[PDB]
Amino acid sequence: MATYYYALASQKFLLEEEPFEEVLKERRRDYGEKNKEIDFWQVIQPAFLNAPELAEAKAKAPEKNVAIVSTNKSFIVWVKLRLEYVLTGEFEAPSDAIPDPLASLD
């Protein structure tokens, strides 16, 4: 089990943040160049939001949502400061409630 950190946005909002998405693309590409295991992901309509421990987040969330997830806390701190209009939190996985931290509900 690992701790995952997240920043949850609306799909609408994240579509207005193209420079941000370019930063994430460049970060993936840089990781590959450095032979660093990818430890951050963008998850459309994340299934983790259904976990009981995330009930407060789900109650606040956009209808069509998307998370930036990482096992690197400092990366999510940056994401929050860069995007601002996101809900943040953390969870442990795999668990009964979150068997796949990267699963989409779509």
Author numbering: 1 to 106
Paper passage:
Mg-protoporphyrin IX monomethylester cyclase (MgPME–cyclase) catalyses the formation of the isocyclic E ring by cyclising the methyl propionate side-chain at C-13 to the C-15 bridge carbon between rings C and D, generating protochlorophyllide (Pchlide). Recently, the small monomeric protein Ycf54 was identified as a second candidate component of the MgPME–cyclase. The Ycf54 protein has been identified as a component of the MgPME–cyclase complex.
We crystallised the WT Ycf54 protein and solved the structure using molecular replacement to a resolution of 1.3 Å. Synechocystis Ycf54 is composed of a single domain (annotated as the Ycf54 domain in PFAM), in which a central four-stranded antiparallel β-sheet (β1–β4) is flanked on one side by helices α1, α2 and α5 and by helices α3 and α4 on the other. This ridge is located on α2 of Synechocystis Ycf54, where two of the highly conserved residues, E22 and E26, contribute to its negative charge. Although individually point mutating these residues to alanine yielded no discernible phenotype, the fact that the ridge is unusual and structurally conserved indicates that it may be of physiological importance. In WT Ycf54, R82 adopts two clearly defined conformations, both of which form stabilising hydrogen bonds with neighbouring residues. On the WT Ycf54 structure, residues D39A and F40A are not particularly surface exposed, so we are unable to speculate as to how these mutations result in a reduced interaction with CycI.
